[PDB]
Design a protein around this ligand. Structure first.
Ligand code: NA
Ligand code: NA
Ligand SMILES: [Zn+2]
Length: 426
């Protein structure tokens, strides 16, 4: 197969205003343009810490120690130099290639590219219009800006390098992630850090035990985030306020811990069964009705605004995205069989637990565990990590028994930065 990222970018490559360009994000201020890299149709990478997407997060300096929460890690200097940004680009590229090298990742990335956020921007119900927050503004060689629609942007982490807990992370663009429309996703991610987990379920799900012997493959972490992005691009994410008041783990239960249904869905495996079957049927009916609303909007559309593109070219983009049926009079409708397949593909087939099987890596067995440790890594050298094998390199002592993920055996590949065990209020 042909690679997912066709250009091996170096951070210092000259801007060209096309796939290497200074850009601005909608709704951020008169931010200084940032240098960004288009790695695939609809997908950009910004090798900067995210001081833009959310107004409440602008400084990278660590809080006072007495304010910091235990599962957190700060490093204000991370991703501030050209060499780091170069390594970041190469690391993220390699992980997209590792994902795309599996049939499951091919399926997911294809769904992501086809998941163009719906043109529901118009005030007038017969007019088809892009929503502005679903684009970026790209500086051209002549110094002018052009608006470019995109689906996904990978960006560096904000102040807290390891990011949110057991509910939200993608963020909400009004109801766009939940009303069938979809919206452009900004994923905070770093290929330069990973976390440790424990190989025994009794230990991994206990807040008091384990130092984090095994390292999570960061391809699984990126796949996890891309699965959320898939839900959000198709507008079928579950409101983070729909949660499981965990009562299957004594330690979660005594601390009143809650996990969003969206996280359980995204992990898959046995976790998804904790989504009450009645609430899941309700969700499905809800999303099915949102899709019907979209078919209706396209059926009523006489005109298109912005764009030089055809009213029919764009009607067909969304017919393809949502797998709509078209009758003899050109009317669009939602087919129940096809909705069931699309919804299932996005929520049951694309799961963390399924990616673990395709990568043949060791991984947490449930989302309902406790983090153990965070490590510094470098996956760019092929002597450290490959597209095909991750850390578990063929023809080395690391090929068998997940030895490459074993931070005790493969110790030169991990630098432990912080332990989380014993910090949890128990
Ligand atoms: Na798993
Ligand atoms: Na070490
Ligand atoms: Zn998640």
């Amino acid at each position: 197969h042909m690679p997912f990222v066709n250009k091996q970018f170096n951070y210092k490559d000259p801007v060209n205003g096309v796939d290497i360009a200074y850009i601005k994000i909608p709704n951020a201020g008169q931010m200084q343009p940032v240098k960004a890299f288009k790695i695939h149709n609809k997908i950009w990478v910004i090798p900067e810490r995210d001081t833009f997407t959310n107004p409440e997060e602008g400084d990278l300096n660590p809080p006072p120690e007495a304010k910091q929460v235990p599962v957190s890690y700060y490093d204000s200097t991370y991703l501030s130099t050209d060499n780091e940004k170069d390594n970041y680009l190469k690391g993220v590229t390699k992980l997209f290639e590792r994902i795309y090298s599996t049939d499951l990742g091919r399926m997911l990335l294809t769904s992501i590219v086809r998941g163009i956020p719906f043109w529901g921007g118009s005030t007038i119900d017969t007019e088809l219009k892009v929503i502005d927050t679903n684009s970026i503004n790209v500086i051209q060689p002549d110094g002018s800006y052009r608006s470019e629609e995109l689906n996904l942007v990978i960006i560096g982490p904000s102040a807290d390098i390891i990011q949110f807990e057991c509910k939200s992370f993608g963020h909400e663009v009004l109801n766009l992630t939940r009303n069938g429309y979809g919206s452009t996703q900004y994923i905070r991610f770093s290929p330069d850090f990973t976390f440790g987990f424990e190989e025994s379920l009794e230990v991994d799900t206990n807040p008091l035990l384990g130092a984090g012997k095994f390292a999570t493959d960061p391809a699984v972490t990126l796949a996890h985030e891309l699965i959320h992005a898939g839900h959000r691009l198709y507008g079928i994410a579950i409101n983070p306020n729909r949660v499981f008041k965990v009562n299957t783990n004594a330690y979660y239960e005594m601390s009143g811990l809650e996990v969003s249904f969206e996280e359980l869905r995204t992990f898959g495996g046995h976790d998804a069964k904790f989504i009450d079957s009645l609430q899941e049927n309700e969700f499905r009916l809800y999303y099915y009705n949102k899709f019907k609303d979209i078919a209706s909007t396209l059926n009523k559309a006489k005109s298109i605004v912005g764009t030089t593109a055809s009213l029919q070219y764009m009607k067909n983009v969304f017919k393809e995205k949502y797998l709509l049926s078209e009758d003899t009079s050109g009317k669009f409708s939602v087919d129940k069989l096809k909705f069931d397949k699309l919804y299932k593909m996005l929520t049951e087939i694309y799961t963390e637990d399924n990616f673990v099987k395709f990568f043949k890596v060791l991984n947490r067995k449930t989302y309902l565990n406790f983090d153990k440790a965070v490590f510094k890594i470098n996956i760019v050298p092929k002597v450290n990590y490959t597209i095909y094998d991750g850390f578990n390199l063929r023809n080395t002592n690391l090929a068998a028994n997940f030895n490459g993920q074993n931070t005790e055996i493969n110790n030169m590949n991990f630098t432990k930065l912080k332990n989380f065990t014993g910090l949890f209020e128990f």
